[PDB]
């Protein structure tokens, strides 16, 4: 047999959603705790990476504005790429 991409299914809605099959063990908990969606987060994560590299020097404010899905919701997604290293904080 081989991997199935199902595992024990994380909490909230994100066990067989479109993208969780790629969500890493880290991003998974980040979206689950924030109740986010796979494709949704996968999108903002990609756009933020391209824009941040284009403008170079994007901070949290730009995140809550570009992907203004909410208040702490964007702060958690951005604080992840920022502290992780995917993007920078000015």
């Amino acid at each position: 047999g081989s991997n199935s991409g199902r595992r024990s299914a994380p909490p909230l809605n994100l066990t067989g959603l479109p993208g969780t099959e790629k969500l890493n063990e880290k991003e998974k908990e980040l979206c689950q705790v924030v109740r986010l969606v796979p494709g949704a987060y996968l999108e903002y994560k990609s756009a933020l990476l391209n824009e941040c590299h284009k403008q170079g020097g994007l901070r949290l404010a730009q995140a809550r504005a570009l992907i203004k899905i909410d208040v702490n919701k964007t702060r958690k997604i951005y604080d992840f790429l920022i502290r992780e290293g995917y993007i920078t904080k000015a």
Side-chain angles (χ1 to χ4, degrees):
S2 323
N3 267 232
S4 307
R6 245 65 150 167
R7 217 231 139 76
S8 185
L12 241 123
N13 253 13
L14 227 98
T15 63
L17 282 185
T20 318
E21 167 153 45
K22 282 215 188 144
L23 285 183
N24 300 54
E25 55 152 48
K26 274 235 205 280
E27 301 207 292
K28 273 180 72 244
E29 182 252 327
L30 180 94
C31 269
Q32 284 155 217
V33 180
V34 169
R35 307 193 207 177
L36 262 151
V37 161
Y41 179 89
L42 274 130
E43 216 197 333
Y44 301 135
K45 222 234 77 203
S46 236
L48 265 58
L49 217 100
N50 215 238
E51 211 121 28
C52 188
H53 200 88
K54 228 157 289 134
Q55 298 187 12
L58 217 93
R59 245 257 187 164
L60 245 309
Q62 305 227 261
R64 299 192 306 163
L66 224 86
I67 60 180
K68 57 140 123 148
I69 63 178
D70 240 318
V71 203
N72 271 31
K73 266 53 78 147
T74 295
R75 250 259 265 181
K76 288 188 174 182
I77 300 182
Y78 217 65
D79 180 281
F80 194 79
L81 305 138
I82 293 289
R83 272 56 184 76
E84 286 286 76
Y86 284 94
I87 60 172
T88 37
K89 213 196 177 137

